[PDB]
Amino acid sequence: MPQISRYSDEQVEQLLAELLNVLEKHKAPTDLSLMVLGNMVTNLINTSIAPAQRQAIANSFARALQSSINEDKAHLEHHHHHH
Amino acid sequence: MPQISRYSDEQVEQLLAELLNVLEKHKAPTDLSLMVLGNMVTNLINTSIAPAQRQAIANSFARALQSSINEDKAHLEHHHHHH
Predict the structure, then answer these.
(1) How far apart are CA B61 and CA A62, in angstroms?
(2) What phi and psi values does residue B61 have, to the nearest 5 degrees?
(3) Of A29, A69, A34, A73, the residue nearest B42 (C-alpha)
(4) In this complex, which of B7, B37, B51 lies closest to A71 when CB atoms are compared?
(5) Which long-range contacts (CB under 8 A, 24 or more apart) does A29-35 make?
(6) In CA terms, which of A65, B26, B44, B67 is 20 to 30 Å from B74?
(7) Least CA distance to B34: which residue of chain A?
(8) How far A10 CA lies from chain B's nearest CA (Å)?
(9) Which residue in chain A has the smallest CA separation from B6?
(10) Which residue of B has its CA nearest to A13?
(11) Domains of chain B, with CATH numbers?
């Protein structure tokens, strides 16, 4: 079943797998990856978004990022699994 | 003339072009693009970024975003050409 997203899972999957392969096709460290993506996203929001709300969306983007970056399952699953 | 962000600029530009090319290829709107990139970056940080510095990278990246996205240009010349 759909994880939680109500947009289009398969569509996002196709895009993510593609974009990831594009980067992996050259292979760059996370440091450089953040460099590329940083300039990309910044310029994207700077141009593809109205100059008035481009800053506001950056704010919510940051919030969404912080709300999406989960380390691990905080609920320690009582799941019996030995190595 | 060269650029200050010449840190793998050759590959950064080419990779960024390809990433944008893929988006334009699939005809993915900004809304969907941000959704994919958001999940992508989050997964990248979750996997390749050490849990010790997951928030360190997250906050510094956010600060960089809100640093780069500001008022439109700090120096405006007269420029003898309107339209």
Answers:
(1) 9
(2) -65, -45
(3) A69
(4) B51
(5) A30/B44, A30/B48, A30/B49, A32/B7, A32/B8, A32/B11, A32/B12, A33/B44, A33/B48, A34/B57, A34/B61, A35/B5, A35/B7, A35/B8, A35/B12
(6) A65
(7) A41
(8) 11
(9) A35
(10) B36
(11) 1-83 (1.10.3390.10)
CA-CA distance, A71 to A66, in Å (whole number)?
11
Neighbours of A45 (CB within 10 A): 20
Contact B39 A12 (CB under 8 A): yes
First to last CA, chain A: 29
Half-sphere exposure of B40 (CA within 13 A, CB side): 26
Technique used to solve these coordinates: NMR
Tokens standing for A59? 């704010």
